[PDB]
Design an enzyme around this catalytic site. Structure first.
Site, PDB file in Angstrom:
ATOM      1  CD  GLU A 143      -3.229 -11.187 -13.432  1.00 23.44           C
ATOM      2  OE1 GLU A 143      -2.925 -10.301 -14.258  1.00 23.44           O
ATOM      3  OE2 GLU A 143      -2.958 -11.082 -12.214  1.00 23.44           O
ATOM      4  NE  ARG A 178      -4.621  -8.110 -14.682  1.00 21.75           N
ATOM      5  CZ  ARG A 178      -4.808  -7.423 -13.554  1.00 21.75           C
ATOM      6  NH1 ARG A 178      -5.616  -6.364 -13.524  1.00 21.75           N
ATOM      7  NH2 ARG A 178      -4.181  -7.801 -12.445  1.00 21.75           N
ATOM      8  CB  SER A 219       3.799  -9.541  -6.806  1.00 24.55           C
ATOM      9  OG  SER A 219       3.538  -8.159  -7.011  1.00 24.55           O
ATOM     10  CG  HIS A 299      -1.767  -5.262  -1.354  1.00 25.69           C
ATOM     11  ND1 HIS A 299      -2.835  -4.895  -2.146  1.00 25.69           N
ATOM     12  CD2 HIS A 299      -0.717  -5.428  -2.193  1.00 25.69           C
ATOM     13  CE1 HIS A 299      -2.450  -4.851  -3.408  1.00 25.69           C
ATOM     14  NE2 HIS A 299      -1.167  -5.167  -3.463  1.00 25.69           N
ATOM     15  CG  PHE A 306       1.606   1.761  -8.320  1.00 24.94           C
ATOM     16  CD1 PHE A 306       2.883   1.517  -8.811  1.00 24.94           C
ATOM     17  CD2 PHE A 306       0.542   1.807  -9.218  1.00 24.94           C
ATOM     18  CE1 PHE A 306       3.098   1.309 -10.172  1.00 24.94           C
ATOM     19  CE2 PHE A 306       0.747   1.596 -10.581  1.00 24.94           C
ATOM     20  CZ  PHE A 306       2.027   1.348 -11.057  1.00 24.94           C
ATOM     21  CG  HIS A 320       0.577  -9.294 -10.435  1.00 21.90           C
ATOM     22  ND1 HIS A 320      -0.267  -8.683  -9.534  1.00 21.90           N
ATOM     23  CD2 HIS A 320      -0.199  -9.665 -11.484  1.00 21.90           C
ATOM     24  CE1 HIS A 320      -1.493  -8.665 -10.025  1.00 21.90           C
ATOM     25  NE2 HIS A 320      -1.478  -9.257 -11.207  1.00 21.90           N
TER      26      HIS A 320
HETATM   27  C1  HEM Z   1       5.564  -2.913  -3.033  1.00 21.26           C
HETATM   28  C2  HEM Z   1       5.147  -3.587  -4.113  1.00 21.26           C
HETATM   29  C3  HEM Z   1       3.657  -3.544  -4.540  1.00 21.26           C
HETATM   30  C4  HEM Z   1       2.945  -2.472  -4.949  1.00 21.26           C
HETATM   31  C5  HEM Z   1       3.442  -1.006  -5.106  1.00 21.26           C
HETATM   32  C6  HEM Z   1       1.584  -2.921  -5.208  1.00 21.26           C
HETATM   33  C7  HEM Z   1       0.558  -2.151  -5.710  1.00 21.26           C
HETATM   34  C8  HEM Z   1      -0.584  -2.655  -6.286  1.00 21.26           C
HETATM   35  C9  HEM Z   1      -1.450  -1.946  -7.208  1.00 21.26           C
HETATM   36  C10 HEM Z   1      -1.311  -0.457  -7.588  1.00 21.26           C
HETATM   37  C11 HEM Z   1      -2.395  -2.798  -7.629  1.00 21.26           C
HETATM   38  C12 HEM Z   1      -3.553  -2.479  -8.599  1.00 21.26           C
HETATM   39  C13 HEM Z   1      -3.080  -2.892  -9.995  1.00 21.26           C
HETATM   40  C14 HEM Z   1      -4.065  -2.421 -11.035  1.00 21.26           C
HETATM   41  O1  HEM Z   1      -5.011  -3.184 -11.350  1.00 21.26           O
HETATM   42  O2  HEM Z   1      -3.895  -1.285 -11.555  1.00 21.26           O
HETATM   43  C15 HEM Z   1      -2.138  -4.094  -7.025  1.00 21.26           C
HETATM   44  C16 HEM Z   1      -2.876  -5.247  -7.203  1.00 21.26           C
HETATM   45  C17 HEM Z   1      -2.685  -6.470  -6.600  1.00 21.26           C
HETATM   46  N1  HEM Z   1      -1.642  -6.813  -5.752  1.00 21.26           N
HETATM   47 FE1  HEM Z   1      -0.079  -5.514  -5.319  1.00 21.26          FE
HETATM   48  N2  HEM Z   1       1.533  -4.288  -4.990  1.00 21.26           N
HETATM   49  C18 HEM Z   1       2.775  -4.695  -4.548  1.00 21.26           C
HETATM   50  C19 HEM Z   1       3.102  -5.986  -4.190  1.00 21.26           C
HETATM   51  C20 HEM Z   1       2.234  -7.053  -4.078  1.00 21.26           C
HETATM   52  C21 HEM Z   1       2.546  -8.348  -3.511  1.00 21.26           C
HETATM   53  C22 HEM Z   1       3.917  -8.743  -2.938  1.00 21.26           C
HETATM   54  C23 HEM Z   1       1.448  -9.109  -3.563  1.00 21.26           C
HETATM   55  C24 HEM Z   1       1.309 -10.569  -3.084  1.00 21.26           C
HETATM   56  C25 HEM Z   1       0.205 -10.981  -2.435  1.00 21.26           C
HETATM   57  C26 HEM Z   1       0.396  -8.324  -4.165  1.00 21.26           C
HETATM   58  C27 HEM Z   1      -0.873  -8.761  -4.459  1.00 21.26           C
HETATM   59  C28 HEM Z   1      -1.764  -8.104  -5.264  1.00 21.26           C
HETATM   60  C29 HEM Z   1      -2.920  -8.718  -5.875  1.00 21.26           C
HETATM   61  C30 HEM Z   1      -3.437 -10.155  -5.667  1.00 21.26           C
HETATM   62  C31 HEM Z   1      -3.545  -7.620  -6.729  1.00 21.26           C
HETATM   63  C32 HEM Z   1      -4.811  -7.750  -7.581  1.00 21.26           C
HETATM   64  C33 HEM Z   1      -5.908  -6.865  -7.020  1.00 21.26           C
HETATM   65  C34 HEM Z   1      -7.115  -7.128  -7.878  1.00 21.26           C
HETATM   66  O3  HEM Z   1      -7.086  -6.725  -9.066  1.00 21.26           O
HETATM   67  O4  HEM Z   1      -8.078  -7.756  -7.369  1.00 21.26           O
HETATM   68  N3  HEM Z   1       0.914  -7.087  -4.474  1.00 21.26           N
HETATM   69  N4  HEM Z   1      -1.007  -3.969  -6.242  1.00 21.26           N
END
Ligand code: HEM
Ligand code: HEM
Lengths: 353, 353
Positions: A143, A178, A219, A299, A306, A320
C-alpha cells in the site's frame, strides 16, 4: 469516494473494514495507481558499509559502480541514494532500486556484469561491508499513501499514476485496509527470520531468509522545496519528535518487533545531502507495526502535528509505502557487515531453533 | 483467551475484527458477564437542574423524592447519584437507574406515584429544571471494560458477574469489537436528533427523539480506596488532562459529533461528594466517538499514562460502558431546562424540519 484498492484488485470480501461506509476522511490523501499489467514489484536495497574515514573514497566509488550497473539492460525503473550512520558508528550508503516485475530484476541480478561483481572474491578483500536486501511484494501485498499528488518517490515512481482522494485513511487500521489482500487475508506472520548460510559472528558471506508476512515500511519526508517558515516548522517542531521515534525503534527493536530500523538521508552521487529523508523499517509483523504507530508516545507525539498542519501544510511532502511478503520473496545477503546490520541482528543462527 | 462477547451472544460472523487471531493484549482487562435472561436493559438518567443557591434545598429534596420512587415496585436494580456544573453555570443533580428489562421500567414509569409526579403541574411551578433521558440498549448493543474485577459500577452492577481476562482490548477499534452486534452490524448512524413536542427556546415541556445508533459513553474514575501516593498520581497527573478533554467535548461538541458532554462527580443523598466520577457523553455516532478517542491530544495523553501505570495500578479503578440504540429505543424529556441542556442543544426544532 475512490478506494485505495485498484479496481482490478477489488473482490468479494471475507474480511471487512473497521469504519462504516458513511466514513469521510478529514483531509485529502492519495495513492499510487497501476493497471492489471503490474503483478509484482521488486524493491532492492543495495548497501555499502564502512566505519573508517580512509574507506570513504572506496565506499563512494562502490556506490557509483552499483548506480552504473543500473544503466544496464533490465536495470530498475527508478532509484534513489541515501546515507545514515547506525548505532554502531558505521556509515551506510544505500541505493534503492525499484523494478516493475520479478523476471526483469532476476535477469539483471544474474547477468554477467552484476553477478560477477557480487560473487567476486574482491567483495571479501575490499574491507567494506556489502548488503542486498531484496524483497518482492505482489500488487495485493503493498500500500502507498501520499499527502501530495505529483512526482511520487519510492515505489509510486514505477506505478502508472496517481489516484483521486481516497477513502481508506485517517484512522488507525486504515493502512491495513489499503492492502488489497486485506479483503481476504489476515497477513499473519509465521516462521522465523533464519540464517540459511554462514555465521553473523564470523563475518564473510551471510544469507538470511525472511518469514511469511514480515512488513517493510518506507516513510518519507521531503522539505527540499519548502519556504523558510515551513522549513523551520519541520526542522524544529516535527523532526525532533521523528528523530526521538527513530532512535527508539533503532535501539529497542526486539521489544517492539522491529528487526531493523534505519533513518536515512538522501544524497547525490558524490555523497552530498539532499533535503529528503526516510525511515526504512523491517517488522516481525504488520500488526506489530500497527501497535507501535497507534500507541507509542513518539508516533502519537509525531502524529497530531500533521492533523494540525494538514490544512495549511504547504510544501512539505510526507508519504509512506508499506509492504508484506511471502518468505520466498525476501533475500537478505551480507558480506563483511557488522553482526547488527539489518536482518543479521535478530536472525536465528543455524543452531538457534 | 476469553472473549468480551458472552457465549450466548456469539454467532456466525459477517463482519470481522481488525487484529489477527494471534493477538494478545499487553495488560489484563475484564468485562461484565450476564446470561440469556438479560436481553435488553434500560438506562434512565433523571435530572434536577438549578442555578440560584436558594434553589438548592428544593433541588436536593426533588432528588430525594426521585430516589424514594426508586424504592417502589419495578424500581431499578441499581442506581447512583451525581452532581455537575454545566458551561452555562447551572448545577445538575442526576440519578441514573438501571433496569434489567424493558417491561419492569415501563411498569414503573406508568405506575401512578411515578406518572403523576412527572405529569404534575408542580413540575412547571417548581422553578427547577427536570429531565428524563431514557435509553434501552439490547445486550448485543452495549460493551463494558473494567480495569478491575470486583464491585462493578453502572450497568455492570445489573449484570451477573465478571469475566476472565479478555482478548478484545488494547487497540483502537477494540471497543467496537466488544459490542456483540459488531459480529454482524456496522452500527451506522442515520436520521436526526429531533424535537417532537415543544420548543427549547421557550422552556416548558420539550420532548426530543433520538436517531439510529446514537452512542452513549459512561467512562468513570474511582479513587476512593487509593492511598495517598496513588491518589496524588490520579489527581496531579491524570485528572488535569482528563479535565482538559472533558472541557473540550463540553465546549466543542458540534465540531466532533458530541451532542452532550457531562463530567460528573458522585454524591450521597445529602449532596456531599464521593471519590468517584464519570463522563456521561452522548454522541452522533459510535464512529465519531472512535475518531475523537484515537486522535484527540487530550485522550491520547491519558491513554499514554494508563499504559505506563497499568502494571503497578493497585487501587485506582477505571472503567467504561458504551451503548448504541435503535432510533425507537430512546426518549429525552425536559421540563424548564436551559436550552443547552443535554439533547436540547443540537436537536432539530419543529420549525426546522
Ligand atoms: C515525522 C514524520 C511523520 C508524520 C508527520 C506522521 C504522521 C502520520 C499520520 C498523520 C498518519 C495517519 C495517515 C492517515 O491515514 O491519514 C500516520 C500513519 C502511520 N504512520 Fe506515521 N508519521 C510520520 C512518520 C512515520 C514513521 C517514520 C513511521 C515508521 C514506523 C510511521 C508509521 C506509521 C504507520 C505504520 C501508520 C499507519 C497507521 C494506520 O493506518 O494504522 N510514521 N502517520
Ligand atoms: C482517567 C481517564 C481515562 C483514561 C486513563 C483513559 C485511558 C484509556 C485507555 C488506556 C484505553 C484503551 C483501553 C483498552 O482497550 O485496553 C481507552 C479507551 C477508550 N477511551 Fe479512554 N480513558 C479515560 C477517559 C475517557 C473518557 C472520559 C472518554 C469519553 C469520551 C474516553 C473514551 C474512550 C473510548 C471511546 C475508548 C475506546 C477506544 C477503542 O477501543 O476504539 N476515555 N481509554
Amino acid at each position: 469516494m475512490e478506494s485505495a484498492i485498484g479496481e482490478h484488485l477489488q473482490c468479494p470480501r471475507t474480511l471487512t473494514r473497521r469504519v462504516p461506509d458513511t466514513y469521510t476522511p478529514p483531509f485529502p490523501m492519495w495513492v499510487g495507481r497501476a493497471d492489471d499489467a503490474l503483478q509484482q514489484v521488486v524493491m532492492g536495497y543495495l548497501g555499502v558499509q564502512f566505519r573508517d574515514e580512509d574507506q570513504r573514497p572506496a565506499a563512494l566509488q562502490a556506490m557509483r559502480d552499483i548506480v552504473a550497473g543500473f544503466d544496464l539492460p533490465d536495470g530498475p525503473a527508478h532509484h534513489d541514494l541515501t546515507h545514515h550512520i547506525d548505532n554502531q558508528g558505521y556509515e551506510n550508503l544505500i541505493v534503492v532500486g525499484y523494478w516493475k516485475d520479478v523476471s526483469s530484476q532476476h535477469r539483471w541480478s544474474t547477468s554477467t556484469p552484476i553477478a560477477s561483481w557480487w560473487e567476486s572474491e574482491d567483495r571479501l578483500s575490499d574491507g567494506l561491508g556489502f548488503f542486498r536486501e531484496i524483497v518482492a511484494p505482489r500488487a495485493e501485498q503493498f500500500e502507498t499513501l501520499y499527502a501530495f499528488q505529483e512526482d511520487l518517490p519510492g515505489v509510486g515512481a514505477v506505478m502508472d499514476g496517481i489516484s483521486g482522494e481516497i477513502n481508506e485513511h485517517g484512522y488507525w487500521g486504515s493502512m491495513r485496509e489499503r492492502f488489497p489482500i486485506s479483503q481476504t487475508d489476515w497477513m499473519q506472520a509465521s516462521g522465523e527470520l533464519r540464517v540459511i548460510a554462514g555465521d553473523p559472528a564470523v563475518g564473510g558471506r551471510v544469507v538470511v531468509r525472511g518469514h511469511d508476512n514480515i512488513a517493510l515500511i518506507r516513510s518519507g519526508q521531503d522539505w527540499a522545496d519548502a519556504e523558510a517558515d515551513e522549513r523551520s516548522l519541520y526542522l524544529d517542531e516535527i523532526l525532533p519528535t521523528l528523530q526521538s521515534g527513530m532512535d527508539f525503534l533503532r535501539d529497542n527493536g526486539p521489544a517492539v518487533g522491529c528487526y531493523s530500523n534505519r533513518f536515512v538521508r538522501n544524497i547525490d552521487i558524490d555523497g552530498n545531502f539532499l533535503d529528503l529523508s526516510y525511515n526504512i523499517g523491517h517488522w516481525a509483523s504488520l500488526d506489530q507495526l500497527e501497535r507501535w504507530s497507534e500507541s507509542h508516545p513518539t508516533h502519537l507525539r509525531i502524529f497530531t502535528t500533521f492533523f494540525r498542519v494538514a490544512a495549511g501544510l504547504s510544501k512539505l511532502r510526507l508519504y509512506h509505502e508499506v509492504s508484506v511478503f511471502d518468505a520466498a520473496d525476501q533475500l537478505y545477503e551480507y558480506i563483511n557487515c557488522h553482526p547488527g546490520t539489518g536482518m543479521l541482528r535478530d536472525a536465528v543462527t543455524i543452531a538457534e531453533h
